[PDB]
Amino acid sequence: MNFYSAYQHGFVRVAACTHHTTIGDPAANAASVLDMARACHDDGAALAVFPELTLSGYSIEDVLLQDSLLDAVEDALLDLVTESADLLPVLVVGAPLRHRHRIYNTAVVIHRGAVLGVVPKSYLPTYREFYERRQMAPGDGERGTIRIGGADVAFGTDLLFAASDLPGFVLHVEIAEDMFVPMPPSAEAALAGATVLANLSGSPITIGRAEDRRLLARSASARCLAAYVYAAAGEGESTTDLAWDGQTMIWENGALLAESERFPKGVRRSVADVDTELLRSERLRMGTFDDNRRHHRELTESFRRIDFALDPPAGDIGLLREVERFPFVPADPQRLQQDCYEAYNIQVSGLEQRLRALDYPKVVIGVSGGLDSTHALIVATHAMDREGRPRSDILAFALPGKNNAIKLARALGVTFSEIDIGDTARLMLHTIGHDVTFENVQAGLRTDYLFRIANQRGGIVLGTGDLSELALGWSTYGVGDQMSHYNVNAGVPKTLIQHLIRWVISAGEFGEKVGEVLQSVLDTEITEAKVGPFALQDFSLFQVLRYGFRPSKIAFLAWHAWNDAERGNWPPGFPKSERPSYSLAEIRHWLQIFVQRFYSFSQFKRSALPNGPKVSHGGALSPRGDWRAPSDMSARIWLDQIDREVPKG
Amino acid sequence: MNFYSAYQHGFVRVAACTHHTTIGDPAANAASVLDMARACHDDGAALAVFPELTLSGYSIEDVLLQDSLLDAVEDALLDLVTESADLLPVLVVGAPLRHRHRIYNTAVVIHRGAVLGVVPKSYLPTYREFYERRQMAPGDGERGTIRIGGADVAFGTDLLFAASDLPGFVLHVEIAEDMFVPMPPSAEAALAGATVLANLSGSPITIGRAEDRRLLARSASARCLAAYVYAAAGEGESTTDLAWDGQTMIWENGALLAESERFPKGVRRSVADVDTELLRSERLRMGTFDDNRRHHRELTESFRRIDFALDPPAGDIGLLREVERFPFVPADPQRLQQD
Amino acid sequence: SMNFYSAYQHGFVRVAACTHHTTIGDPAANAASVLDMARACHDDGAALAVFPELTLSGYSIEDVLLQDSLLDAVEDALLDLVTESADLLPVLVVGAPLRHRHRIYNTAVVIHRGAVLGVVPKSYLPTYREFYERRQMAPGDGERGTIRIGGADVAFGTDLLFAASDLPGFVLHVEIAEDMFVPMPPSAEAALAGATVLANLSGSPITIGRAEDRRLLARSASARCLAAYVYAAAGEGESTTDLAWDGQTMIWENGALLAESERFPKGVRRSVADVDTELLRSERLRMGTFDDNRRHHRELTESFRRIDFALDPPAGDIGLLREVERFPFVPADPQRLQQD
Numbered sequence A: 001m002n003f004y005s006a007y008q009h010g011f012v013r014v015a016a017c018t019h020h021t022t023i024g025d026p027a028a029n030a031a032s033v034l035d036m037a038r039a040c041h042d043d044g045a046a047l048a049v050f051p052e053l054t055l056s057g058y059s060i061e062d063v064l065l066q067d068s069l070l071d072a073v074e075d076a077l078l079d080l081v082t083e084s085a086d087l088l089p090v091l092v093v094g095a096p097l098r099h100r101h102r103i104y105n106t107a108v109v110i111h112r113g114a115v116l117g118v119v120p121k122s123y124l125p126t127y128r129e130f131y132e133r134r135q136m137a138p139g140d141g142e143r144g145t146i147r148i149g150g151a152d153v154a155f156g157t158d159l160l161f162a163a164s165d166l167p168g169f170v171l172h173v174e175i176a177e178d179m180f181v182p183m184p185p186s187a188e189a190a191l192a193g194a195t196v197l198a199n200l201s202g203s204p205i206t207i208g209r210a211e212d213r214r215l216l217a218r219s220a221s222a223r224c225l226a227a228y229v230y231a232a233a234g235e236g237e238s239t240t241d242l243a244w245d246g247q248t249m250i251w252e253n254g255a256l257l258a259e260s261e262r263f264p265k266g267v268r269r270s271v272a273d274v275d276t277e278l279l280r281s282e283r284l285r286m287g288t289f290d291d292n293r294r295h296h297r298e299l300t301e302s303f304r305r306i307d308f309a310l311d312p313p314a315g316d317i318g319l320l321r322e323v324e325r326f327p328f329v330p331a332d333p334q335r336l337q338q339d340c341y342e343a344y345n346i347q348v349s350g351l352e353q354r355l356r357a358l359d360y361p362k363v364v365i366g367v368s369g370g371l372d373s374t375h376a377l378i379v380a381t382h383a384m385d386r387e388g389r390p391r392s393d394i395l396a397f398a399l400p401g402k403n404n405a406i407k408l409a410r411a412l413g414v415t416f417s418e419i420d421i422g423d424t425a426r427l428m429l430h431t432i433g434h435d436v437t438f439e440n441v442q443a444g445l446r447t448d449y450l451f452r453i454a455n456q457r458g459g460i461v462l463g464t465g466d467l468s469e470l471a472l473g474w475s476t477y478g479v480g481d482q483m484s485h486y487n488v489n490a491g492v493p494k495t496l497i498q499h500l501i502r503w504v505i506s507a508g509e510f511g512e513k514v515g516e517v518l519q520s521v522l523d524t525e526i527t528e529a530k531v532g533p534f535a536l537q538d539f540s541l542f543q544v545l546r547y548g549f550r551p552s553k554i555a556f557l558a559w560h561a562w563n564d565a566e567r568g569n570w571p572p573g574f575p576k577s578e579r580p581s582y583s584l585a586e587i588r589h590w591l592q593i594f595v596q597r598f599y600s601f602s603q604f605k606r607s608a609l610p611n612g613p614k615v616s617h618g619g620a621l622s623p624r625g626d627w628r629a630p631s632d633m634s635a636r637i638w639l640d641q642i643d644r645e646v647p648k649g
Numbered sequence B: 001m002n003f004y005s006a007y008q009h010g011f012v013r014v015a016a017c018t019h020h021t022t023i024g025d026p027a028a029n030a031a032s033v034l035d036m037a038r039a040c041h042d043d044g045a046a047l048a049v050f051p052e053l054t055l056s057g058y059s060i061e062d063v064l065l066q067d068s069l070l071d072a073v074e075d076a077l078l079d080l081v082t083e084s085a086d087l088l089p090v091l092v093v094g095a096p097l098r099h100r101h102r103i104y105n106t107a108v109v110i111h112r113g114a115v116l117g118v119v120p121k122s123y124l125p126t127y128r129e130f131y132e133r134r135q136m137a138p139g140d141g142e143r144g145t146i147r148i149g150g151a152d153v154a155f156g157t158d159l160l161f162a163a164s165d166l167p168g169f170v171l172h173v174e175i176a177e178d179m180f181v182p183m184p185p186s187a188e189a190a191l192a193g194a195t196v197l198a199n200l201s202g203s204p205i206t207i208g209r210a211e212d213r214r215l216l217a218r219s220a221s222a223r224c225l226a227a228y229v230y231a232a233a234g235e236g237e238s239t240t241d242l243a244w245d246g247q248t249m250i251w252e253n254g255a256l257l258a259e260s261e262r263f264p265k266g267v268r269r270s271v272a273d274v275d276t277e278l279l280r281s282e283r284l285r286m287g288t289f290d291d292n293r294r295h296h297r298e299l300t301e302s303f304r305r306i307d308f309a310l311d312p313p314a315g316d317i318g319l320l321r322e323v324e325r326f327p328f329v330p331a332d333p334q335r336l337q338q339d
Numbered sequence C: 001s002m003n004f005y006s007a008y009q010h011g012f013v014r015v016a017a018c019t020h021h022t023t024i025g026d027p028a029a030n031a032a033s034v035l036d037m038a039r040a041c042h043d044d045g046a047a048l049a050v051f052p053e054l055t056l057s058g059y060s061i062e063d064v065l066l067q068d069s070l071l072d073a074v075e076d077a078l079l080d081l082v083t084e085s086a087d088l089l090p091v092l093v094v095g096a097p098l099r100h101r102h103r104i105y106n107t108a109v110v111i112h113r114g115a116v117l118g119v120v121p122k123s124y125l126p127t128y129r130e131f132y133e134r135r136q137m138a139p140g141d142g143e144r145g146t147i148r149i150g151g152a153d154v155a156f157g158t159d160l161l162f163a164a165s166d167l168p169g170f171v172l173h174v175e176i177a178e179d180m181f182v183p184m185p186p187s188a189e190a191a192l193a194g195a196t197v198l199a200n201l202s203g204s205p206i207t208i209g210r211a212e213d214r215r216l217l218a219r220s221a222s223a224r225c226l227a228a229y230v231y232a233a234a235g236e237g238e239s240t241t242d243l244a245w246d247g248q249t250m251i252w253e254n255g256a257l258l259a260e261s262e263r264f265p266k267g268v269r270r271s272v273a274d275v276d277t278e279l280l281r282s283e284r285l286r287m288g289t290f291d292d293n294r295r296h297h298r299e300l301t302e303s304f305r306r307i308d309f310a311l312d313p314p315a316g317d318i319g320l321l322r323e324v325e326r327f328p329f330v331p332a333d334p335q336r337l338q339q340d
């Protein structure tokens, strides 16, 4: 396999194009279409979607009904078809075409010298600035075939274009207004199998219309678990009564992959790599999507599937896609602030319920001065404040076997104390006739003490292990830090914890002293890679937990995100000395370790897990929630996948 | 005519309510529901929507299948119904109810001492943190009636509640996940006539989920030329594995009318005046909306219409709505800069 | 003319229910255990080998079913089996989580002589008590059409019958686990439509009393449907994170037990018996109300698709794997004879 090929990793390269309109002149429009299609070809694109009525111009009104115009459209369309014999991408071009009694506003799907199909718009707006029913017939409910340059090709609203060599790429095409009705053609097509939804739009621009386009194309892509590819008309449409902004965009399951300049001068393309496996993975898991199809089975079974062989380029053509380094930590500051606010309120409100339900016990917690336990102590305080409970009901414990610990505790005003576990550990090690056991005897005694104090003092022990530690099994099982009465960090990955502390500092409601101590914790602690860098492990974890991607796909994505520290954006709080870049060899190394630990070694530790709230849309690792898996399984197949598919460096 | 009455100008006052959950304790949830409904009444609201499985709590898992729990839900539901005899608004309350072989995740629509109908959730998520098909049966495709405290009332995914004195107020009710599938019950109901779409949600909060809720309730309300009234569960749900933010919101044709504080302490309501005439005017003009109905005629004609008489307050009750001085000039600077 | 000592020439069909060694999360290993047992079934001249539910992945792996590498490994392993089957006599019925359309299905792949004859999805997916199947997998009830497996379109759905063109008494229908437990099981419509041999691939974690439940339903099925019922459960290797497994296999014929293997074995086990297709044929010939029931459910029963294959069984003496009592009227079992 070619590890550097995006097509081999389930990517399909898609283009939404806005061309130069010459109204009433089809050979000129076709010439602009052919030039852009040659570009999309050179880019290795599999699909190029153009605007509504591309070949005539959308805005020409009664001129659509003129024989010379209709004639010119056909001649021009047939030239394109002939040119397409040497073009890689499927071309979706607009054209007013005669069929039966009337003209239809259609999209012609073209590929390698043939017309695969012809799709008519279903809903024809005839209100406000729109007059479509005057010239054109509604396509909804039309089936059968249409004759185009001596051939009978599929015609109708029921068409799917499936790539026979790219099973994840199934195209449905709709037109403009089609996407705006309560029950759009594209939603039935997704149910029926379409993974990529194209929209050819005219869409005269008005104040606020761009926002409407986005709301509907975006919600469509999220509801239908699909890529949505959208192209509007720009320069060259008539301005007798309307203006045009040439907007193009590409959405994937709710996220913007690419958009182009509004009101540009000259032609514009959006070009993105759509991840078909991502779409595949979400449909695999969201069972109610398939339930919805089954409930509309007669609607969804009637589609006709037109097959074509794409034969994409096999080599390295890069990756036109933003792969963030931190799936759990958005590089956008407004976004990361939102996530922090939510993470923190999740942790707190979760603990508050546990406390209310237990009639407000004391809170017992081991504070080591580390990131985790610090953040947990902050969470616990805010919870007790919100519930109108004295901060002295928090029992924080230093359990040496740092100063930041006692300082924070003193600053917050919780009840602080120290218990030296060393003698108890000595006694235990001697009694046992005594490395893992030595480490573990201490970690165990910590938990054992806290538990007994909780019994003694009417409290509950607060766990502090984080999501990355759960994932990797980096904890001490049962009698050890893995165990507690309620774990507030169980759902937060290590990569996020530091930003939550930053957020608490920046908000500043604990006051300046607490602020300074927390800041000190930060400065001290960012200065256990037998399990590798947490940045890479949190990366793999997201891919595995959310999408179940194979290891070679995970390596490809990580390498694209991490291999060059100059490219892509870093979240806030990463000074340049801490902007590592990783080689393929390194990614490959830590990934072998990740699959071994994640799929084989660690599950038993997750299997007997204390209560705590899920936090990230990435998922959590509760065996009662997002991750059900055997405690007694080998990881051989994952390890073998890496062996065979990921290059050594 | 009373010129100062919102109801006489085609407004309908609507409330999305997040109550205090006491898991496993129906009479306590009912008491929280009754208190908020009495508030919604005092405000002259016509509609009060509560969160998914209001009466039992959404988060209780196999406890849903315990007879004493199911029994307590019924008793509590029937007490509410009796109390509603003196309440103005239509109450939409969640309840696990037994019907035929199983329990359904349902919304009970209650009005002035009667149950107008019972709507079961259609799509039951059984993935990630959701386990709903384990305890509860899918309601998609169910019609007929259900027996509730000695009476046969309409049961199913095909119901429309039409105010006989307020023609612009036609209610459809769906539940949580129903709004997230490619072809939601509420989209067919809008084509068939519903102007106000209610959603009872549980919706454990996760990073980014609040944005997903908004994207889907908003696009719904825009595509369906309707008001969309949404209530999520908050304080009191179990935190064994999840947390809850109590979010409530009301959308009208793509615009936010009202939302309440996330993660509140105590109960919260969004209350807005919905402009039924604005909805009516947009449907009047967008022909392709009606074309879409005609194309799905067998789907859209099969709805059952349950009529009720609202009898709203006739006097001045103010106007719970932001009316901008300059329809053409947004007061929000980021907005105006865009325009 | 004929070979009087050949069981095949007297209307017998040799059938095998196999419980293989599960290696959870490891399709190539399960496939190797499957191939070894199938080679044995071949040597025994068997016409049919039924394996346990989700054979190729392991039944108990939960959300691991949703992992691309696992789904990918299953496909590869399945296609290898198919290639090996070119030299195997028996039709192989193997379990596999397969992707189709939006989801994965819990399916049985029917394989014969180098081709996939058909792919059958479980219809009813238990999601209660210790079972969580709807979370990972889609219900197969009401699915028809085809599925693409290693470059070919093969029949897919709950409406399939596999008919031996040279052994008219041998018509196979396949269902899965829970399918046999609902008031109106796939296999009862399939019997009405023609099926003489009903296969069941089972996972079936063992609980106190469950083996008695399995028997009561497989046995009453075989009696009500006038058919052979061939049943295989999962054994050693399934995860014991929450469940245990007994590996039970059994073969029933019109209400009678022809063979069962050792519960909780160490190592792989097979039930192998000679099914008497003429006996089944003779009972159906005479019980008119069986055919009246089919006529009353004609639209249900006429819709099955019939996939034909040529078995070409061994012609020689291969013994007779069947208890033939000396005294049809006098049971050898004392408790039974006392009753009589």
Ligand SMILES: Nc1ncnc2c1ncn2[C@@H]1O[C@H](COP(=O)(O)OP(=O)(O)OC[C@H]2O[C@@H]([n+]3cccc(C(=O)O)c3)[C@H](O)[C@@H]2O)[C@@H](O)[C@H]1O
Pocket (backbone or CB within 6 Å): A436, A439, A440, A443, A469, A473, A474, A475, A476, A477, A478, A480, A481, A528, A601, A604, A631, A632
């Ligand atoms: N599948 C399975 N089912 C049931 N039991 C299984 C098992 N696999 C191992 N075991 C047993 O479980 C035990 C091994 O697990 P465990 O006892 O947890 O210990 P183990 O994972 O071997 O070691 C703990 C490691 O975690 C590190 N650690 C400890 C504490 C805190 C942190 C931190 O960074 O916060 C890190 C520490 O450096 C050490 O390397 C053994 O008794 C083993 O026999």
Ligand SMILES: Nc1ncnc2c1ncn2[C@@H]1O[C@H](COP(=O)(O)O)[C@@H](O)[C@H]1O
Pocket (backbone or CB within 6 Å): A365, A366, A367, A368, A370, A372, A373, A397, A398, A399, A400, A401, A443, A446, A464, A481
């Ligand atoms: N030296 C220490 N003093 C107080 N608590 C500690 C100490 N070491 C570990 N702990 C507690 O045990 C947790 C995990 O232990 P570990 O990661 O093994 O050092 C910490 O987050 C604290 O809650």
